[PDB]
């Protein structure tokens, strides 16, 4: 019995009449590149992708960010080509590259990277860390406003926040120094939310910081809607995501009904839902910036739980499922003597009635 | 010899999924292979069989010699067996309030 294939079978478009005439993958890398392209295509048979790949929603992810900047590709391409010609014109650069002694200035690369691919690299990275999934329920935005956040450590050092690097709760004991490029007259909102720190609800967050109606980049002048509370990752609960969100405001907004008291040491009040917060204020507010770090427990978290939050320090453990054993047989034929140890409960000798 | 666990069957870690003398079925995700080509489960969960593109190891001279002679655009396929893990690795539970 035969069932006809449900679609094009692999390798059917290969004409085997002229087999000796056809070109071949004389190389391994050549075959591999075609194989990986084949693995990526949709197939009518069962695939690893069907069973293991994440099931993304069919509808495209709604964009909620600022519009892309307007650029003239023509003028850019011209200026871009001009610059390379000057580099290649130099005879010294050719010699260092030929002698394998040249290098790139990483500081300049980073500087330019912030303005070209940075925003889109920050979006894919925030998507891999699942922030749009949790903060906005899948809605995406390109953080087109570079946001610089640094925790002051000591007197001469700073600890940047970047996107996913690890900052300790001790380093983040006190509010970070924040700076960004904004025009005069613009209004912004900055919040810090722990995505993973909530101790009661799995789907909720903690509002660690809220600054509203900031004038331009003058963060200090912003309304202290929610005071800064350092991250408190519980011990043995793993690594937590801490996300700064910079919002561009269309107008001055009144957040009096969502303000938390100062100081705010009630975890029930700091319970927060960014998707609910933004949905309420989406009409006059737009996400613009994005930075975030990872945070695990350190000794300083005890002080937060004991003193600031006035509670006991919760401790967690990673607990694995109990090991599987088949049902015990009366006669475990050919099993080793220790088969009985697998179904024993205690190691100390028992005595029954005696 | 042959399949011991068909499509959709629940396996525990260690379960021999199939025995064979030559590779009819290739190991996929969470499926180990013993030195007699025995396919066995590395995790607990559900057995799947799929058709995947076959890319040999560059040190496997005989298989690499095969693909290098293939016409451009021709891709080899094999049948793979997988185990979709049923349970997570563990959970975080409250052990103290100190």
């Amino acid at each position: 019995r035969r069932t006809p294939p449900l679609g094009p079978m692999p390798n059917s478009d290969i004409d085997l009449s002229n087999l000796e005439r056809l070109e071949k993958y004389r190389s391994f890398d050549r075959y591999r590149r075609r194989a990986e392209q084949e693995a990526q295509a949709p197939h009518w048979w069962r695939t690893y992708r069907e069973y293991f790949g994440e099931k993304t929603d069919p509808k495209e992810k709604i964009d909620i960010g600022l519009p892309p900047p307007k650029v003239s590709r023509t003028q850019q391409l011209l200026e871009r080509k001009q610059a390379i010609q000057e580099l290649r014109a130099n005879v010294e650069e050719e010699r260092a590259a030929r002698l394998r002694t040249a290098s790139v200035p990483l500081d300049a690369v980073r500087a330019e990277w912030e303005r070209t691919c940075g925003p889109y690299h920050k979006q894919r990275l925030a998507e891999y860390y699942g922030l749009y999934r949790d903060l906005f329920h899948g809605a995406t935005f390109v953080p087109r406003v570079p946001l610089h956040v640094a925790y002051a450590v000591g007197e001469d050092d700073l600890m940047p926040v970047y996107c996913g690097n690890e900052v300790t709760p001790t380093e983040a004991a006190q509010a970070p120094e924040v700076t960004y490029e904004a025009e005069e007259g613009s209004l912004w909102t900055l919040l810090l939310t722990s995505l993973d720190g909530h101790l009661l609800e799995p789907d909720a967050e903690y509002l660690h910081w809220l600054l509203t109606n900031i004038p331009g980049n003058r963060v200090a002048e912003g309304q202290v809607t929610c005071p800064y509370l350092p991250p408190f990752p519980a011990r043995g609960s793993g690594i937590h995501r801490l996300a700064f969100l910079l919002f561009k405001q269309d107008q001055p907004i009144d957040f009096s009904e969502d303000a938390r008291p100062s100081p705010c040491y009630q975890l029930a009040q700091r319970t927060f839902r960014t998707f609910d917060f933004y949905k309420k204020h989406q009409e006059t507010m737009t996400p613009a910036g994005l930075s975030f770090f990872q945070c695990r427990w350190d000794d300083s978290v005890t002080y937060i739980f004991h003193q600031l939050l006035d509670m006991r320090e919760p401790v967690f453990e990673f607990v694995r499922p109990p090991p599987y054993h088949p049902k015990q047989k009366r006669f475990p034929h050919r099993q080793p003597l220790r088969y009985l140890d697998r179904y024993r409960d205690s190691h100390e000798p028992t005595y029954g009635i005696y | 010899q042959g399949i011991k666990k068909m499509e959709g069957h629940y396996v525990h870690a260690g379960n021999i999924i199939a025995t064979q003398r030559h590779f009819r079925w290739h190991p996929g995700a969470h499926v180990g292979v013993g030195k007699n080509k025995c396919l066995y489960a590395l995790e607990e969960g559900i057995v799947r069989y799929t058709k995947e593109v076959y890319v040999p190891h560059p040190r496997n001279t005989e298989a690499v010699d095969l693909i290098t002679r293939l016409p451009k655009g021709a891709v080899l396929y094999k049948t793979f067996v997988h185990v979709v893990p049923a349970k997570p690795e563990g959970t975080f539970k409250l052990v103290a309030m100190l």
Binding site: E20 | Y54, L76
Partner: peptide, 21 residues
């Protein structure tokens, strides 16, 4: 499997030239 629409997907010997001394 022979009764399945995907039977033969692993066929490859027809794509190679016959080299049998």
């Amino acid at each position: 499997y022979k009764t399945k629409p995907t039977h033969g997907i692993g066929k490859y010997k027809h794509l190679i030239k016959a080299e049998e001394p």
